[PDB]
């Protein structure tokens, strides 16, 4: 579907809108099922807006899933 | 190591230099071993220069590995 490795949070885009685009692309992609979650986590870390990248870095290592990181970011706005 | 999902072939960069940067980053990353090759293949498809993206699309489905695609691109220059 969407070129998942090109997806980055735009300057007018909310984190959740970016996460939804990214995840739709990853789920529609040719990646092995077990690669999806790590790819999503890394693209959140690397491809969100710079301030959000910084916020994600504060989350403890106990937050391991995309859903945990989405709740983390949104609830700190 | 390098943020593997940010890596894209620059306008003055050869395909092999980009492939080497990308692969170094992927190999140094937190991705599961089995995710590496598909991630590399997709980042070649999506993150090379536009003309190279087009060339990669011509390669038949029988070319499945990063090394096969690297030889394919380089030998057609």
CATH number of the domain within which A28 lies: 1.10.1200.30
CA torsion A20-A59-A6-B17 (nearest 10°) is: -160
Q: Which two tokens stand for residue B26?
A: 């992927």
- Which residues on chain B are in Cβ contact (under 8 Å) with A43? 5
The stretches of A1-77 forming alpha helices (DSSP H) are 15-27, 33-47, 50-58, 66-74
CB contact under 8 A, A34 and B32: yes
Structural domain that includes position B36: 1-77
Closest by CA position to A37, among listed B26, B38, B41, B32: B32
- B74 and B16 Cβ atoms separated by less than 8 Å: yes
Token digits of residue A21: 């685009």
Tell me the two tokens of residue B45: 């498809």
Structure tokens at B4: 């593997």
Q: Among B5, B31, B34, whose Cβ lies nearest the Cβ of A5?
A: B5
Residues of chain B in contact with residue A29, where contact means CB-CB under 8 angstroms, are 42
B35, B42, B43 ranked by CB distance to A38: nearest = B35
Residues of chain B whose beta carbon is less than 8 angstroms from a beta carbon of chain A are 3-6, 29-32, 34-35, 38-39, 42-43, 45-47
Counted domains in chain B:
1
Q: Is A33 helix (H, G, I), strand (E, B) or coil?
A: helix
* Residues of chain B neighbouring A1 (CB-CB closer than 8 A): none
Which experiment gave this structure? X-ray
- Look at the block and give the residue holding tokens 């050869």: B14
Resolution in Å equals: 1.6
User: How many Cβ atoms from other residues are within 10 Å of residue B40's Cβ?
Assistant: 23
């Amino acid at each position: 579907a969407g070129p998942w490795a090109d997806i980055m949070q735009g300057p007018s885009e909310s984190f959740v809108d970016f996460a939804n685009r990214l995840i739709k692309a990853v789920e529609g992609s040719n990646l092995p099922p077990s690669a999806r979650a790590p790819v999503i986590i890394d693209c959140f870390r690397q491809k969100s807006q710079p301030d959000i990248q910084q916020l994600i870095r504060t989350a403890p290592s106990t937050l391991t899933t995309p859903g945990e990181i989405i709740k983390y970011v949104l609830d700190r706005q």
